């Protein structure tokens, strides 16, 4: 009921993602500058989802049920709202179509059915939670850091957090003059607002990953 | 009590020129802050940024005068853009000579210099593209300024009794203030409280070449 907190590592996220069903043509990448011309040229486009790691201070959403599993739910938020990037017949693709046929929870996956598929994905990928560049803590331990995700679905911009009991958070309408998610002012502003609290506390604990090609 | 100044680049530029800002410089509209194309149209280097929303520092003493103090903060921390001999330049050097308040102006010398600026320019406080409210009435809107001084980045508010606020060190890859992440982030955080509240009351001006 407790997992080792996943590292904000493009390789680890990409690993998990591919095993869930993300097509090989796509991957997660490092986002180190979010309002930077040059740097965004070393960044694959279109950016289809953005995962943010930071201190806790009309779309598919999953309620988080397993401790330290926020990173896996971020991947599930990124992939489930971008079905087009999944491999037909992959574990996640099968999971999503099964609930749409049966019309269980059209978009709020809080079921004992969602928990079992997550608990098995977890049981089949336990060592992956521990990989990365940094040393693995103990699942039992608290982290003070949390992952969350952004996506554009049917013209809107949403922030998806498995721990936000109220469900997905609507940020407002998309801007059709957006090459992708990085060019959405509603995201940059929402993100920049978190960093401002960081800058005040003198904490540098922030990371972002984007899901794009390659 | 003065009439609240309109976030109009012509009005800011007019006041600034009368105080001493060289003619080669002026205030301009900033409509987008993280967008490429729209940045090719804005004059660089941007030396100060004024924000309207819901290191020399000046305490605000006159009601609704925040916009003038914003111009004072923008200009006073950019002395190299002032006309030698102009009114503000004289005022600034005077206090340096006598060493009154090396950077925190809350004196007698400063409240007079300002009331003198205020009374020599009353008519411009009402100009622009909108209608003039009564100086007596409140606005709910405020002016603050951002400047890069000694590689430090500051937010200047005449109403912040604690004085200027340091936001941290500058980034030298930055040709100017628009390219300072610390400013964009601090501004962006004000807008987010505005995106939640459905308030669209926001304006920005940059001080750059004419």
């Amino acid at each position: 009921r407790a997992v080792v907190p996943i590292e904000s590592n493009p390789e680890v996220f990409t690993n998990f993602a591919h095993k869930l069903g993300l097509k090989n043509e796509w991957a997660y990448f490092d986002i180190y500058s979010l309002t930077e011309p040059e740097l965004l040229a070393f960044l694959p486009r279109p950016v289809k989802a953005i995962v943010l790691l930071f201190p806790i201070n009309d779309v598919i959403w999953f309620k988080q049920s397993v401790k330290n599993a926020c990173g896996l739910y971020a991947i599930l938020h990124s992939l489930s709202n971008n079905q087009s990037l999944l491999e037909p017949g992959s574990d996640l693709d099968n999971f999503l179509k099964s609930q749409s046929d049966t019309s269980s929870s059209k978009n709020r996956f809080d079921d004992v059915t969602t928990d079992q598929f997550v608990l098995n994905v977890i049981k089949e990928n336990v060592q992956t939670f521990s990989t990365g560049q940094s040393e693995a803590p103990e699942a039992t331990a608290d982290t003070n850091l949390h992952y969350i995700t952004y996506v554009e679905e049917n013209g809107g911009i949403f922030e998806l957090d498995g721990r936000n009991l109220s469900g997905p958070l609507y940020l407002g309408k998309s801007d059709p003059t957006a090459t992708d998610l990085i060019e959405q002012e509603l995201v940059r502003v929402r993100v920049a607002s978190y960093m401002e609290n960081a800058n005040e506390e003198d904490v540098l604990n922030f990371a972002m990953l984007g899901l794009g090609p390659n | 009590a003065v009439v609240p100044i309109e976030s109009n680049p012509e009005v800011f530029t007019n006041f600034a020129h009368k105080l001493g800002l060289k003619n080669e410089w002026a205030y301009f509209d900033i409509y987008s802050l993280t967008e490429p194309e729209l940045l090719a149209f804005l004059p660089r280097p941007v030396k100060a940024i004024v924000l309207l929303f819901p290191v020399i520092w000046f305490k605000q003493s006159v009601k609704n005068a925040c916009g003038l103090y914003a111009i004072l903060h923008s200009l006073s921390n950019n002395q190299s853009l002032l006309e030698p001999g102009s009114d503000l330049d004289n005022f600034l050097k005077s206090q340096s000579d006598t060493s009154s308040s090396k950077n925190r102006f809350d004196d007698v010398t400063t409240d007079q210099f300002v009331l003198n600026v205020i009374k020599e320019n009353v008519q411009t406080f009402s100009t622009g593209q909108s209608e003039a409210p009564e100086a007596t009435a409140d606005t709910n809107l405020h002016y603050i300024t951002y400047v890069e001084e000694n590689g430090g980045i500051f937010e200047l508010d005449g109403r912040n009794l604690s004085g200027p606020l340091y936001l941290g060190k500058s980034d030298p890859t930055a040709t100017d203030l628009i390219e300072q992440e610390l400013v964009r982030v601090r501004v962006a955080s004000y807008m987010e409280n505005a995106n939640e509240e459905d308030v669209l009351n926001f304006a920005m001006l940059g001080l750059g070449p004419n």
């Binding site: - | 100044i5 309109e6 509209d29 987008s32 925040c66 916009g67 809107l141 009351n201 304006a203």
Partner: peptide, 17 residues
């Protein structure tokens, strides 16, 4: 398109104290 993500085409001309 406003600045946040008395008009002039959008840029607002507001008054602040």
């Amino acid at each position: 398109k406003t600045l946040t993500g008395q008009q002039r085409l959008l840029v607002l001309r507001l008054r602040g104290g």
